[model samples]
Target: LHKEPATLIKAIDGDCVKLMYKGQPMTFRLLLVDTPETKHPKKGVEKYGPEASAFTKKMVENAKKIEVEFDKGQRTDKYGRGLAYIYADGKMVNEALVRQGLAKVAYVYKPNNTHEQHLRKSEAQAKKEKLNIWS
Candidate 1:
């Protein structure tokens, strides 16, 4: 992970979030996890979307501060949002979400996947507990 650090501003849904960097705000897509979408201008809303949204919001809210780390994979999607591995309150926010079963691992399957092994194991624990989406 690389680049300047960012402060989390808000949760857009589950997979995406708003962040502030160098006094400018932007959006970020979590690198290895996908939480259910709460709303989409194109896709509309989805089942369990609200739950996922709540999970994300609460976690973000609990964070004392947010920091962003970039990976050597696809930097962003078509929407132009940065792709990141987020850190909140000394924990990896993306990994925590998956660990708690609020998200499903959606790895980029790239060559320089720094967080691959850990995220995979976190997902397995969530599934084993039959938590959230895994339930």
Candidate 2:
């Protein structure tokens, strides 16, 4: 896995966001977690989707620093977005969302499993507490 400094351009949703990496605006899909859909054409906004999106935006926008952490495996998603973890002020945004019960651990693929266990633990804790999505 590798981590690089990046500037958060926007939070598209909870799990999908845009970043300015190396002076180029790129879309990134947060790894190991899936939040409710706030922008699906047919599905529309799922429960807590808007809240998740807002949380991400709030976290990144106020962060003193941000970063994009890439896994050792595939670096890009099918839609051309970068598949990685987002860190805002040293905290993993992916894990934060899961811990808050606004997201769940999903898309467990190989080589890119660097932080899966960490995310899983957070998800379990949230589940046990019946927080947000768990509720």
Candidate 3:
């Protein structure tokens, strides 16, 4: 995973965020997670989409710092945006999204499942508590 310094620019969606990498704006899609579509032109607005987007925005904008850890393999998606795990204030924004039920674990046991267990466990806890979208 390519971990580096970055500035939190804006959260595009729940799992998609824009950041400043090396002084240039870079879109980094959160790895191993997915959230409802808030701005999908076709999908319009899915259930819990706004809540998920707002949750991500709060985590990003209110954080003291934002760091990105990339996936080992493909760096960017078809759109040329980086795929990464975002961290802020010693907390992983990715995991927090799941733990709070604002997002869902989008990956499982596989070749490069770095934090699959941690993410799955967080989802389980959120489900148990019936938090947010999990309700």
TM-score per prediction, in order, is 0.86, 0.96, 0.91
Specify the highest-TM-score model's number: 2
lDDT of 3 by residue, 1-135 (tens): 656889988889988899999899999888888898788788889988998888889989999888888765677778998878899887899899899998889854254468888999999999999998888
Q: What is the RMSD of candidate 3?
A: 1.7
- Residue 80 accuracy (lDDT) in model 2: 94
lDDT of each: 0.80, 0.92, 0.86
Per lDDT, what order, best first?
2, 3, 1
Candidate with top lDDT is 2
| Segments in model 3 whose C-alpha atoms lie over 4 Å from true places | 108-110
Q: Give candidate 2's whole-model lDDT.
A: 0.92
lDDT of 2 by residue, 29-93 (tens): 99989899898777899899999999999999999999999998999989999999999999999
Candidate 1 lDDT tens digits, 2-60:
54667778788877889997798888888878777867766667766787788777877
- Residue 22 local lDDT, model 3: 83
| Residue pairs of candidate 2 with colliding backbone atoms | none
Candidate 3 local distance difference test against the native: 0.86
